[PDB]
Amino acid sequence: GKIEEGKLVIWINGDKGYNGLAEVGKKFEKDTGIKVTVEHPDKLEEKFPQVAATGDGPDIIFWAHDRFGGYAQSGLLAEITPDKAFQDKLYPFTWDAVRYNGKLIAYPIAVEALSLIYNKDLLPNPPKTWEEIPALDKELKAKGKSALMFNLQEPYFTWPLIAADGGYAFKYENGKYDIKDVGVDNAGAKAGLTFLVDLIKNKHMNADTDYSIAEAAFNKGETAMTINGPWAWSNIDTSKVNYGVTVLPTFKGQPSKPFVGVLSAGINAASPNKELAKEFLENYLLTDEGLEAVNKDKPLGAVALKSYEEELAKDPRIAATMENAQKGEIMPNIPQMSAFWYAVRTAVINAASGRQTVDEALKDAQTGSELYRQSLEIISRYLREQATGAADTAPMGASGATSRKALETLRRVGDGVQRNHETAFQGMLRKLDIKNEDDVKSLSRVMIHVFSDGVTNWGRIVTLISFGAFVAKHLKTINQESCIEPLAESITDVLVRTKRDWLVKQRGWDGFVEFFHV
Ligand SMILES: COc1nn(C)cc1C(=O)N[S@@]1(=O)=NC(=O)c2ccc3c(c2)N(C[C@@H]2CCO[C@H]2[C@@H](OC)/C(F)=C/C[C@H](C)C1)C[C@@]1(CCCc2cc(Cl)ccc21)CO3
Ligand SMILES: OC[C@H]1O[C@H](O[C@H]2[C@H](O)[C@@H](O)[C@@H](O)O[C@@H]2CO)[C@H](O)[C@@H](O)[C@@H]1O
C-alpha cells in the first residue's frame, strides 16, 4: 500500500492503444530518465477503487469519464489544475465531462461513441431501422451469413437500443439531473429490450455473444454488421473487410442513443509522482505527436486536442462517430453510475438468457439503480428527526409511498432496538468517542467489520440504522449537527454496497415494510 517514487505506472483498458501509449512513455523516459510502465489489467475499473483506497495502484488511470465521479467522491483522484494556455487547447465540453463538484478530476483524451459497422461486400447499403434486421438476417442466412453480431455481455452496447424509445438512466431537464428519476423499467426501455430478446428468441442473435466472438465473426466476414467504437477499427483494417461506419439503426422511428464516453486520464491521490504525471499527460500525451502514437495503435475517436481533432475530423468514420454522439447523451459521472451499469448489465444478461422475463429483469435493474438514493432518503430522515425531535416536511418524491412506509416501519422497530439496547448503545457510543466529522469518517471501516461480515437480515439492518440514529442524537447534543448528513451518507454507502444483491432480491424497502408488517 505505497506507490514507488521516480517512475510512472499507467493503467488503460486492453481494447485501447496501450502499445502506442508505451511509445509515448519511451519518449518521456528519453527526456527525463523516468521509466513508464503501461499495464492493461482485467476489470481495471473495479480494481482501481479497491487498490487506490489502500494508497496503492497506478499513478495514472485511463477510463471513460463516467467512473471518475465515484473515484473523486472516494478521495482517490488528485485535483487537475492546468493553466489557461493548456485548458484552451482542448474542447470545453471535454473538460465538462471530467468536472465533479466544481473541480477538474482528470485530463480528457478523446470522445467515444458506438457506430454501426457494416461489410459493404455483404450489405452495400446498411439498414436504417432495427425492425428490418430480422428480414435481412433471413436473406443472409440463406447465403450462410448473419445480419448482426455485437457484445451482449456489456450493457454499453445494448443501451442505445434500450434508450431509443424512452429508456434513461437519470432524467436530465433544465440543465440538471434528477437522480431521483430513473427510466430503466419504463415502456421505452421494455420495448428496446423486448426487441433484443426477440432477436435472440428468433435466432438472429445468440445470448452468449461477447466482444471477442462478435469481433472475430465480423473480421472473418461471417456477419454483415457489428456495433463497436473507434478502438475496433485497427483490427478491421488488418482483416481487409470492406467496411463502412454509419448511424446506428432507428427503433420505432427514433434514433439509437449511445451513452457517449470521454476517455480520461486521472492521477491517483496516493501518487508521489503527481508532477511527473502532469508533465507526462500535458507535454507528452496531449500533443499532436502523443495522440498520433496512441491513435495509430488503436483509434481514439474524436480527440479532445483541437489541433489534432482538426486533422481527424476529415475522416468519415469520425464524422459517423460524432453523428452517433450527437444523437446520444454524454454519460453522467455521478458516483451512482457504477450501480446503474451493474443493474442494467445483470438485466440484459438475464433477459437475453431467459433467466428472467424483460419485465422481471428491468424491475430489478430499476430497484438496483434507485437503491442508494431511496436508502439515503429513509436513513437521513430517520437520523435527523431522531436528533432534532421534528420530522422533515419536504415531499418524499419518487417511490414516496415506499419511503414513507419504510420510515414509518423504521420508527416502530428502530425506536424498539434503541430502547431495549440503550445500555449497549451508550457503551459502544462512549467506546467509539465520536466528537467531529474526522471521527465519523472512521466509522465506515468498523460498520463494514461489524455489520457487513455478520448475518444479512432486516433485523441487523435496523440495528445498523438505529445505532446511527443513537450517534446522530449525540452529535446534535454536542453542537455537531453538521456531522449527521455525512453519517447518513456513510451508513447508506455501507448498507447498499455490501448488501446490494440481497436488498434487490428483497424488492428493496418494499421487502422491509412487508417483513415488519404487524
Ligand atoms: C430479533 O433481533 C433483532 N431485531 N431487530 C430489529 C434487531 C435485532 C438484532 O438482534 N440485531 S443484532 O443482531 N445486531 C447487531 O449485532 C448489529 C448490527 C449492526 C450493527 C451493530 C450491531 N453494531 C454494534 C452494536 C452497537 C451497540 O453495541 C453493539 C453490539 O454489541 C457488541 C450490540 F449491542 C448488539 C445488539 C443488537 C441489537 C443485536 C453497530 C455498528 C458497529 C459499530 C459502529 C457503528 C456505527 C454506526 Cl453509525 C452504525 C452502526 C455501527 C454496526 O451496526
Ligand atoms: O458496459 C458498461 C460499461 O460501459 C462503458 O464502458 C465502455 C467504455 O466506455 C469504452 O471505452 C469501451 O472500453 O467499452 C466499454 C464497454 O465494455 C462505461 O465507461 C463503463 O463504466 C461501464 O461499466
Side-chain angles (χ1 to χ4, degrees):
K2 265 192 195 81
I3 299 160
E4 193 173 14
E5 191 185 359
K7 65 192 301 193
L8 287 175
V9 180
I10 308 177
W11 285 7
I12 187 159
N13 206 40
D15 59 7
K16 301 317 196 292
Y18 55 77
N19 291 136
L21 189 57
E23 176 197 315
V24 182
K26 294 307 303 189
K27 188 91 183 153
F28 186 78
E29 185 188 335
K30 189 170 185 163
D31 281 354
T32 66
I34 305 304
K35 291 217 99 78
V36 179
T37 307
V38 183
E39 308 188 338
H40 48 97
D42 295 331
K43 299 183 174 199
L44 78 88
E45 82 286 8
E46 297 184 13
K47 284 177 186 168
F48 180 75
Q50 297 168 355
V51 300
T54 68
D56 215 320
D59 294 280
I60 304 164
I61 176 184
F62 283 77
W63 199 262
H65 73 277
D66 69 297
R67 293 272 161 182
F68 279 73
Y71 302 159
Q73 191 64 42
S74 300
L76 306 182
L77 296 178
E79 188 186 352
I80 303 305
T81 59
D83 68 357
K84 184 185 153 60
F86 185 76
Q87 281 202 51
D88 291 346
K89 290 183 160 76
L90 315 190
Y91 293 104
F93 83 89
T94 71
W95 285 119
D96 294 345
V98 295
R99 193 171 299 104
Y100 184 72
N101 291 352
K103 301 186 176 166
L104 301 176
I105 61 169
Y107 291 94
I109 310 296
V111 181
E112 306 176 340
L114 291 171
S115 297
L116 186 69
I117 303 171
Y118 70 100
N119 185 336
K120 290 172 166 170
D121 293 343
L122 295 178
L123 286 177
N125 300 305
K128 303 295 263 179
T129 72
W130 279 95
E131 288 91 343
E132 80 199 79
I133 291 171
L136 280 181
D137 187 63
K138 290 182 198 179
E139 270 298 323
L140 286 160
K141 284 283 166 68
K143 309 179 186 289
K145 306 292 179 178
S146 66
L148 173 64
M149 298 180 63
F150 71 95
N151 187 3
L152 304 186
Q153 305 314 310
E154 281 296 339
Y156 185 70
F157 296 85
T158 289
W159 186 253
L161 173 56
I162 290 165
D165 193 41
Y168 59 89
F170 306 101
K171 189 77 171 194
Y172 193 72
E173 287 181 316
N174 304 281
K176 278 207 93 289
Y177 291 107
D178 191 356
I179 301 159
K180 313 191 67 164
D181 191 353
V182 171
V184 166
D185 71 353
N186 66 31
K190 289 178 170 185
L193 185 55
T194 296
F195 194 84
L196 187 86
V197 174
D198 283 346
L199 286 174
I200 300 169
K201 281 183 174 180
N202 294 324
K203 312 215 179 213
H204 308 304
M205 295 199 312
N206 188 308
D208 298 326
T209 300
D210 64 7
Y211 190 93
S212 285
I213 294 169
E215 180 178 47
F218 188 76
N219 298 1
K220 289 175 195 169
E222 292 180 328
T223 194
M225 297 181 286
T226 193
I227 293 168
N228 224 326
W231 56 85
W233 299 338
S234 275
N235 288 350
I236 309 172
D237 287 338
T238 301
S239 82
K240 272 37 157 200
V241 171
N242 178 26
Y243 73 100
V245 182
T246 194
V247 62
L248 291 160
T250 65
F251 181 57
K252 296 176 68 175
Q254 286 154 107
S256 297
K257 302 214 308 176
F259 250 152
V260 179
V262 178
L263 180 71
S264 300
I267 297 173
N268 194 333
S271 174
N273 305 298
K274 293 193 183 71
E275 283 308 309
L276 286 170
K278 172 183 171 74
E279 177 69 1
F280 176 76
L281 294 170
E282 287 187 19
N283 294 335
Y284 293 77
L285 179 58
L286 282 159
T287 65
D288 293 337
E289 63 274 4
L291 294 178
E292 181 172 69
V294 179
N295 198 72
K296 272 167 72 208
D297 182 9
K298 300 294 175 72
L300 284 166
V303 295
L305 187 73
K306 292 160 169 186
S307 64
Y308 192 43
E309 184 47 26
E310 285 169 23
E311 296 195 335
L312 299 185
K314 298 163 171 170
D315 186 346
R317 303 174 302 169
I318 301 297
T321 301
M322 289 314 290
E323 184 178 355
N324 281 305
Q326 287 166 22
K327 290 164 189 291
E329 303 206 334
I330 194 78
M331 286 186 277
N333 67 358
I334 65 179
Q336 291 70 41
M337 282 302 291
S338 187
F340 160 77
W341 282 129
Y342 182 83
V344 178
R345 175 180 297 114
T346 306
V348 170
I349 287 169
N350 289 355
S353 75
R355 203 166 295 98
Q356 288 180 293
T357 67
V358 169
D359 289 325
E360 288 169 343
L362 291 176
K363 178 53 161 218
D364 282 358
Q366 184 73 22
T367 300
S369 298
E370 69 197 6
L371 191 60
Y372 178 84
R373 188 276 306 168
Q374 184 161 57
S375 302
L376 180 59
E377 199 64 51
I378 294 159
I379 292 166
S380 168
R381 281 175 188 248
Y382 184 60
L383 268 54
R384 288 182 294 110
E385 74 180 26
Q386 286 277 300
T388 64
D392 189 344
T393 56
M396 279 296 196
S399 307
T402 294
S403 296
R404 181 164 39 72
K405 284 171 183 189
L407 179 56
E408 248 159 30
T409 301
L410 189 52
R411 286 170 182 166
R412 182 159 48 79
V413 302
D415 290 20
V417 172
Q418 293 189 65
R419 160 173 76 78
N420 286 315
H421 300 263
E422 190 168 36
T423 320
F425 275 35
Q426 193 56 228
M428 188 57 67
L429 177 62
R430 292 194 210 186
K431 189 189 182 201
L432 293 168
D433 184 42
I434 307 156
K435 303 183 304 305
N436 52 59
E437 68 175 33
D438 288 302
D439 298 346
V440 165
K441 286 170 173 169
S442 81
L443 294 171
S444 181
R445 304 197 193 287
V446 50
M447 281 190 285
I448 292 162
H449 184 279
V450 177
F451 166 68
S452 297
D453 299 330
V455 168
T456 309
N457 55 51
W458 284 120
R460 288 194 78 261
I461 292 165
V462 168
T463 306
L464 168 77
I465 298 162
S466 299
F467 190 67
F470 196 86
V471 172
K473 287 182 202 172
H474 180 69
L475 291 167
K476 164 77 174 189
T477 298
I478 66 164
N479 194 32
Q480 296 289 338
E481 195 171 343
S482 72
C483 292
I484 291 161
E485 192 61 24
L487 180 71
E489 285 163 1
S490 174
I491 295 161
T492 302
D493 173 64
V494 173
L495 176 59
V496 306
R497 262 188 34 241
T498 71
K499 307 301 171 169
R500 181 191 66 209
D501 294 341
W502 187 90
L503 289 165
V504 170
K505 196 185 170 207
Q506 306 317 313
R507 301 178 291 113
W509 290 102
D510 292 332
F512 172 71
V513 168
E514 278 259 45
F515 181 87
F516 287 125
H517 183 247
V518 74

